[PDB]
């Protein structure tokens, strides 16, 4: 598709003039497959589906100042390693 | 429950009596009690005669049994009276044969029956009556206490001795025709039991016997409209009965008998009502009058004036509690039964509505 | 089976002494993890323990001085029935710590982490074997703000001072089936949480304290949450979701990414209350609080007086007397139901929303609805049978043989009583639930059977009224005569009949029309509007029939006078 | 006539009734008082009796 | 001219009144003031038979104080037993209306009559068991008023045509006639001595008649209204009669004058029944209202108030031995008091 | 779809189906929902709630069974597999599966 890859991008609304805010986003691919016999026996609870999730997250962030006194962090690098808020 | 043998028999007898009286009550509640009042010249005899042709089925099983018992008792009494007269006369006229005397003595001893007369007694009485001496003694002792129908009973003793005898209504009335004071009669209208109480042949003291008649559904009052002079007595009697304390709660029905006689009398032009009732001249025909075609205006005016006076005297007090239902009476038509049935239905409906708070 | 994992994974050991950027234990046949076996490695950035069925226990101080490590993930613990406390310690750069699918029956200590990260996220799930959360378990875990997501936690209860000396951002406790009960002192020393998720928690009630700082709350599918805290308590509340539609109306009143500092002017709640259950008390008007009480008092007093007069009569019983006694009993039942409804409203005066669920779900509402149906049906049947027997005894007055007796009327009365009982008990069976409307009325018309039943009841009532009117007209025609007619008596009878018919016409016609309109799914008036009719038009019979029937009766007056004389008040 | 006969009968009845004797009221009073006193003890209505001895329990 | 006869009658009446006044000194109330009046008497119902169907017109007690006879205007004559409150037999009658009842000393014969002039006699010891008319005593020109079995052979009855006659069962004829009276006769009473009996006339004049004398003996006009009931003192030396004016009076065969007046300002309804106690110390009478009262002859003061009947008391009777007293009302319920 | 960065759609992948009581492992063709869906991270923290990230998964699945050849006795020789005809990216329920960190485990029988 046309979704941007895992790289830093300017803040759509938090990019103050003279200092664009860097945000981390991407289109990292993910793969899933049915749980095999070994996978099924490795889970205490009954699970009939296994999925692997990979998300583009910022490797590191710096301290930045936003308008109105709100404290925000500016991303410095982007990579696809794992996910934090994927679970719901 | 537990009870003794004598106690059980007594309880069984009491239960049987209770069942019998309940059965009697079932019929009693269905019968409407009505009382008839009228003067000697009021024509009440003609009024009862008209309805007599439509008696209640002629006779009933209980009524038939009662009539048979009464006839047997009357025959026994007549035989006893004849025997007493023969034995107490100047000459001891005995029976033609000793067998007849023995039969008469046995019948006198057997007169203590509970209402049923054996055929042997009837045959003995008939045989004795055939004797010339017995007939002569009876004729010579006609002034004794023997029943007036003794000759009829002796002549009809042959039919009475037969089983399941059915005496005629006239014969039953004659047997019960005495100084009783009550002339009971039965008639059915719309399959409804109706009683009528003809009261008379006694002292004219209504303050002594009207007391018990407070349960009568309605009281029929009949007066002859032909007699102008008798009105004052009729008016006084009506006022007295209307104000009666015991009868101040029962409605009345008025019949104006002798309509044809009144029409004939007023046709002569004498107009004697004016002298008796001076207010008749100032009276006027009500706007609601519906005289029949061909009727003379004077007769209709007099009848309506009489009806208005009767209504006015009745409306003196207690109008709501009980009403008045006057009707033109003529003993030439059978419509009187329908009129009285309609009046009874109306008064029953009014009484029912009184306790339902609709009036 | 054979595996290509970098660690040796032999001799029942994990082989942690292996250089790898991201440690993994997928399909690793390791059952015992040596204590402090992760030392000597610094190239590892993240540690993942998944797809390890052979794992049974973890040694204490497993991850110590793991400065390089920042995220730890534990999942698929088939036999992890025990975890040594203090496994995680000395993790200044710790960011996320997730433990899922663990059968450990002991809560793993996390206060020794001493993480210095700006935002620390801890996730616990599938903790079926977990008994309860130890007290002060999260105290000192992170100096900065720490977010805890205990989704699907099996803890039975929360110890006092569970979160103290820490700034909690969010507290997710969804799918907490065993967390139905919790102490109110859990947040005695926690500045928050800002957002809470108690969906499917089945919590009996929320803590009194600590809700002031809560901004958002999630209580989806919270059937056990039949009560809510004080409205003024949620001063900072801005948006929340409540399972019960009625509870959402509590926040209606007052005491996206571009929004920024801007916040909604009024709280937002969903789902909105249903139309059949308007956000109001039993009485929607101030004056109804007194009019209803006065009407109920008058009706109950009249019914009691009539019952006392009739039951103490020493005269022979009559069919009209028995019918009047039954009507008085029906009026007494209706008055008792109205009094119970008024008492319930008074008890929950000013807090209708809080107790709406309990009142509408308890046996009280069902009993009130049953009484309301039964009394009305019995009164209607008594009135129509009275009219029918009056017509029969007036039309055939002369035929005394064909007259009703007590023994014959008892059978008809018993049949009518059984029919009314079945009619009232059918909705309790499930034909039409009485919980649809807060006034305990069978308003469940969605089902075709219920709508058909309501239409049949309305048609039966209309037919009974029409039959009564026809009988009265026939009585009037029969009584009237062409010649032997009295103007005064006829006028009095006509006026009595007119008042008798109208006293029920202008009590049944509006209610019947409203019921017919509601049956066809075309509500002409709202529930609040219908409340006025139900409180003003319904009790007309209970307040008019006794006075108009027994009070204005010669026999009743005589009985009352005799009773007064016997009591000494001659 | 009938009136004359009725008057004669009434006069005869009055004359017959006027020939009756009279007794002192005091003697009758004493006799009645003595009879009442003698028969007072045999009056269940005047003197209450126990329900055991009463045959109408 | 009847002027001489009227003057002679007036002179005789004046002489009789003067003699009565001279022979009378004071009322018994002053003499009875030395005796303490009887206290309140409490009466509780013991038996109540609802088997009676129609209104009760008359009732008579039994000589043995075991069986009581009741009659109804509907036409059913049924006898009850006080001990068991159970009917023994039912006697249908050809005339529905009844106004009198009787019970022979031996209890073998029972007679009743009403508005119809034909009187009937019934036996309780019939050979076939079923009761039937033994004979007929018709011929009266007036309605039957009251009856009383003086003995098992002779019966004295009252007729509505101001005439009283004595009939014999064996002969069935008026052996003695008492037509020499003015006004109708309502009730009859038999004193302890059967030789003399007192008849209560419809007017205010009370006449005493003898079985053999055939003529009146004493005439008392103390009443102010019609007399409907009369009772005789057990000793036979006095009798009491009720009046429609509620002014009950007591008459003595020796004093031949009124003795006491039992009336109250609040009592408007008259007296329809009268009965004395075994010793006569207490008198029981029924008024036109639905409440019965007990009067003290010696004290002339109220003893108690009884309101066990919802209608007028048709008649009242007292047993010879005073075992119990029963009052019959116009309703279909009979109340027994003890 | 485009050969690069394919969306979350079913693919003709191979999955191994086996049971604990049946040591024999059988691999058959099955539909596996794989691909990429848009994702983003909140630009601000401490003010607004974190935005959940959609993960490719299967929405509708069909149950298929195959014969078990000579599996050990004492257990039911029935194997059930899920085949998805449509795939979409959405949040994964906690009890629905064990979605989490990637594993890259082989899809065959070891």
UniProtKB/Swiss-Prot annotation, chain C:
Sulfated. The chain crosses the membrane at residues 290-311, 322-342, 366-388, 409-431, 452-475, 497-520, 532-553. Disulfide bonds join 365-440. GO terms for cellular component: centriolar satellite; endosome; plasma membrane. Changing residue 542 to Y: In LHR; Leydig cell hypoplasia type 1; micropenis. InterPro entries: GPCR_Rhodpsn (IPR000276), GPCR_Rhodpsn_7TM (IPR017452), Gphrmn_rcpt_fam (IPR002131), LRR_5 (IPR026906), LRR_dom_sf (IPR032675), LSH_rcpt (IPR002273). It is a multi-pass membrane protein. Residues 1-289, 343-365, 432-451, 521-531 are extracellular. The keyword Magnesium does not apply. Changing residue 280 to K: In LHR; Leydig cell hypoplasia type 1. LRR repeats lie at residues 65-84, 93-114, 118-140, 144-165, 167-189, 192-213. It is found in: Cell membrane. Glycans are attached at residues 68, 143, 164. Residues 1-35 form the LRRNT domain. Its main location: membrane. Keywords: Cell membrane, Disease variant, Disulfide bond, G-protein coupled receptor, Glycoprotein, Leucine-rich repeat, Lipoprotein, Membrane, Palmitate, Receptor, Repeat, Signal, Sulfation, Transducer, Transmembrane, Transmembrane helix. GO terms for biological process: adenylate cyclase-activating G protein-coupled receptor signaling pathway; cellular response to gonadotropin stimulus; cellular response to luteinizing hormone stimulus; cognition; development of secondary male sexual characteristics; G protein-coupled receptor signaling pathway; G protein-coupled receptor signaling pathway, coupled to cyclic nucleotide second messenger; hormone-mediated signaling pathway. Gonadal and thyroid cells. The modification Sulfotyrosine is found at residue 257. A lipid is attached at residues 569-570 (S-palmitoyl cysteine). Changing residue 569 to G: Loss of palmitoylation. This is Lutropin-choriogonadotropic hormone receptor. The gene is LHCGR.
From Swiss-Prot, chain D:
Adrenal gland and brain. One of its GO terms (molecular function) is GTPase activity. It is a lipid-anchor. GO terms for cellular component: heterotrimeric G-protein complex; membrane; plasma membrane. The keyword Ribosomal protein does not apply. Its main location: membrane. It is found in: Cell membrane. Keywords: Acetylation, Cell membrane, Lipoprotein, Membrane, Methylation, Prenylation, Transducer. The keyword Transit peptide does not apply. One of its GO terms (biological process) is adenylate cyclase-activating dopamine receptor signaling pathway. Belongs to the G protein gamma family. G proteins are composed of 3 units, alpha, beta and gamma. In this context, interacts with GNB2. The heterodimer formed by GNB1 and GNG2 interacts with ARHGEF5. The heterodimer formed by GNB1 and GNG2 interacts with GRK2. Component of the TAS2R14-GNAI1 complex, consisting of TAS2R14, GNAI1, GNB1 and GNG2. Forms complexes with TAS2R14 and G-proteins; these complexes play a role in the perception of bitterness. Component of the TAS2R14-GNAT3 complex, consisting of TAS2R14, GNAT3, GNB1 and GNG2. Component of the TAS2R14-GNAS2 complex, consisting of TAS2R14, GNAS2, GNB1 and GNG2. Guanine nucleotide-binding proteins (G proteins) are involved as a modulator or transducer in various transmembrane signaling systems. The beta and gamma chains are required for the GTPase activity, for replacement of GDP by GTP, and for G protein-effector interaction. This is Guanine nucleotide-binding protein G(I)/G(S)/G(O) subunit gamma-2. The gene is GNG2.
Swiss-Prot record, chain E:
Coiled coil: none annotated. Pfam families: WD40_Gbeta. Disulfide bonds: none annotated. GO terms for biological process: cardiac muscle cell apoptotic process; cell population proliferation; cellular response to hypoxia; G protein-coupled receptor signaling pathway; phospholipase C-activating G protein-coupled receptor signaling pathway; positive regulation of cytosolic calcium ion concentration; retina development in camera-type eye; sensory perception of taste. The modification Phosphohistidine is found at residue 264. G proteins are composed of 3 units, alpha, beta and gamma. The heterodimer formed by GNB1 and GNG2 interacts with ARHGEF5. The heterodimer formed by GNB1 and GNG2 interacts with GRK2. Forms a complex with GNAO1 and GNG3. Interacts with ARHGEF18 and RASD2. Forms complexes with TAS2R14 and G-proteins; these complexes play a role in the perception of bitterness. Component of the TAS2R14-GNAI1 complex, consisting of TAS2R14, GNAI1, GNB1 and GNG2. Component of the TAS2R14-GNAT3 complex, consisting of TAS2R14, GNAT3, GNB1 and GNG2. Belongs to the WD repeat G protein beta family. Guanine nucleotide-binding proteins (G proteins) are involved as a modulator or transducer in various transmembrane signaling systems. The beta and gamma chains are required for the GTPase activity, for replacement of GDP by GTP, and for G protein-effector interaction. It comes from Rattus norvegicus. The gene is Gnb1.
UniProtKB/Swiss-Prot annotation, chain F:
It is found in: Secreted. Changing residue 3 to M: Requires 2 nucleotide substitutions. One of its GO terms (biological process) is signal transduction. Glycans are attached at residues 12, 29. One of its GO terms (molecular function) is hormone activity. It comes from the Eukaryota. High expression in the placenta throughout pregnancy. Disulfide bonds join 8-56, 22-71, 25-109, 33-87, 37-89, 92-99. Encoded by a cluster of genes that have evolved by duplication from LHB. HCG-beta is encoded by six non-allelic genes (CGB) clustered on chromosome 19q13.3 and named CGB1, CGB2, CGB3, CGB5, CGB7 and CGB8. Two specific hCGb proteins that differ by three amino acids in positions 2,4 and 117 have been described: type 1 (CGB7) and type 2 (CGB3, CGB5, CGB8). The CGB gene first arose in the common ancestor of the anthropoid primates. Heterodimer of a common alpha chain identical in LH, FSH, TSH and HCG and a unique beta chain distinct in each of the hormones. This is Choriogonadotropin subunit beta 3.
